[PDB]
Amino acid sequence: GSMEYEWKPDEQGLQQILQLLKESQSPDTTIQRTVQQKLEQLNQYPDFNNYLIFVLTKLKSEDEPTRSLSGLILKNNVKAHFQNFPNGVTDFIKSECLNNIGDSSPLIRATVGILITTIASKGELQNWPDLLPKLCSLLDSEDYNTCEGAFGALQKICEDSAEILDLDRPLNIMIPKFLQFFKHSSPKIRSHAVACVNQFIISRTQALMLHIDSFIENLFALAGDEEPEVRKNVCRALVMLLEVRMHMHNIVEYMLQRTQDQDENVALEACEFWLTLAEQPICKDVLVRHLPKLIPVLVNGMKYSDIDIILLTISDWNLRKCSAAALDVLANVYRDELLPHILPLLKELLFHHEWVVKESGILVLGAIAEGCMQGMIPYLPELIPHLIQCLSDKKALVRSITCWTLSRYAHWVVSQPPDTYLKPLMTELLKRILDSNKRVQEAACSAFATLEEEACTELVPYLAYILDTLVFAFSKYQHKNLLILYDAIGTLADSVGHHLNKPEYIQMLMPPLIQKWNMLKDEDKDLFPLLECLSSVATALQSGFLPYCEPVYQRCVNLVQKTLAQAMLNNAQPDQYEAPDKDFMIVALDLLSGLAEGLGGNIEQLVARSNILTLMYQCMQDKMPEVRQSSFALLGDLTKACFQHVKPCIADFMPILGTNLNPEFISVCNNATWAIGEISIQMGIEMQPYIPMVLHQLVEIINRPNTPKTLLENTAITIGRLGYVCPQEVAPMLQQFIRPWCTSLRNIRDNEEKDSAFRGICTMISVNPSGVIQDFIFFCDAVASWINPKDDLRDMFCKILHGFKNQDENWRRFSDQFPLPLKERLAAFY
């Protein structure tokens, strides 16, 4: 009795909708494409969705391929167009979907379930607030399909939306009910519970840390459960808890015994545990014992599955990748200390005949290279040739993995004679780069890139064959590997530097890049790598690139102009104008950057008669850090190129860099900092006024923990130059910045930047000598960094530095505290 309610449609649209569904099930394809569009077009009503769900709930006298299809098209009508949703009509969807879930038919259960989940995750958890309490009340079990359906709905809801739940904070009452179903008889319910709870563990919410003590104790009881899903969610829970928590004695045996499970998915869910463990500092003194059982298991998984060989695409994270990664982080934890565990296996598999295993062996060699590098060197002189000859294999996977794994020992290959190792590697590598198989081209290129990156100037004599084969591949490649070809040539010019500047090498390399240059338009995204490629090439061709400087420079300035214009338009009126892709600015600037770094003063004629400085001053204020990074880099290159044109704009530049000194934008800060450096050595004494704005930030930056060494080096050079030109304003900070300055300035070459930096510090010390005394050790340390100093600089060190030593009794007790080689190098050199 009491009170009730319901909804009733009419015989109007039900017949037409039923004909549209019965014909929307037609075996023809044109009928599906027609009727499905007509139904996605008959949504202009507020009542239509109540028609569909009326077919789902009350139309109990109709075949299920029609009912479930109606509910599914309702799913798409809510998930798709939900802004024009009638609220009162959707109420019927809420009540009917909520109360008709325990239907005995599994199909209706599944479609209603996905209706509830899509209504929740697409309709948010706010507008409908009586859903979760009624689901949790319906969760107290009855028959079977009821609590299982509402439970699964809570699984997909808790899998999608999770943070938002942290309804009077209801999760406190959720966990015990899960625990009530945590010791359930049916395995599926439990597998739903574990996966339900596994979402709120990495988020380390405040509701679980109270009900966790017995939670995990109970979690261990599901160790011997048979349903692969239960093992999946449980092992998942342990892997996730390994990151935010520190029974380790038997869990290692359960996991290692479970790593060889019959299901590769579950074995993966248990395989991430080794990554999460090897990341934490606990793995050092807990994992070491039972390893000889672990290593072969990993190698047992590192072979390609029977499934994956046929799809060659592959997935993106498998037991293969997870095993290789686990072996990676473990090798990085142990360094040379894992040779015994593996070496017999390598000696075996590396010379097998069934290649499916040999591939695994070569991959394992690639997996321990970075980790166990120092202990692997002695075995190498025989290892590489077997890989060299392995490059001549006929099967593709072994050839490619030979390219990459062979590429991983680029240092030892290039740190030995060339005609012995580097020449044959380059030869065969180039011969397999021109392959009929795609992955061999891409992986062989991405191996050549590393080979040049570690080889550098050793590639000068062979540039004819290198460029010949690489441009043969240029005209012979496709598109997805062409990006990596641009990578290879860019890394080339970056590696072999100026020695590229020969007219016939230009005749090999430049005609195709000019063809690709001419055929492409400005709105084509493929210009992103090309310019970048040319950028590095513009660094190497130097003055030989003069005949083509005008058009390239012009096109870059134009691109910048257009992009900035569009930016302004989107800034003034979003609803009418378009927003641009600012990736066009950076790359352009990069080229311009590189252009200066290739031509120097030869760019003069171009920089004056082109309103480009103003464009830079407009770029340096944008929102994305990338354009400030690249724009400041260009500012440095232009400052060292020509300063007769930049001088006035300097007045409006230094304040910008005054606010662009921020470590949160590392990629920018360095460049910004570097700019000031190249400014000071050009501004001379004129650099005087702008000091108090940049200096007090720079010194605070140079004494920071967890700071990249490149930023401390460019900051060091900047402070040095600011001191060389403005010693009276920079000098008093010596007690405050002298420590990490020379502490970090030990890992540099000897040219001009370090020279002007040490001139600056020498003038600043001659002007304020009181600052460095208590830390003078460090200074002497830095003085041990010079191998070829100039005459005047040498005099600067030996004369005054001699003054400190001449004022002879205490410099022994104070001197014999740092190593002898530097001691007698300073004592004999200065």
């Binding site: 990748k321 990676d328 990156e453 990578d487 860019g490 970048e532 950076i586 990074q629 570097w674």
Partner: peptide, 18 residues
């Protein structure tokens, strides 16, 4: 010089499984 997303990009997109 420049903490280049160029050099870091072309370094990252070098293909490998390990």
């Amino acid at each position: 010089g420049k903490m280049d997303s160029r050099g870091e990009h072309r370094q990252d997109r070098r293909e490998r499984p390990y």
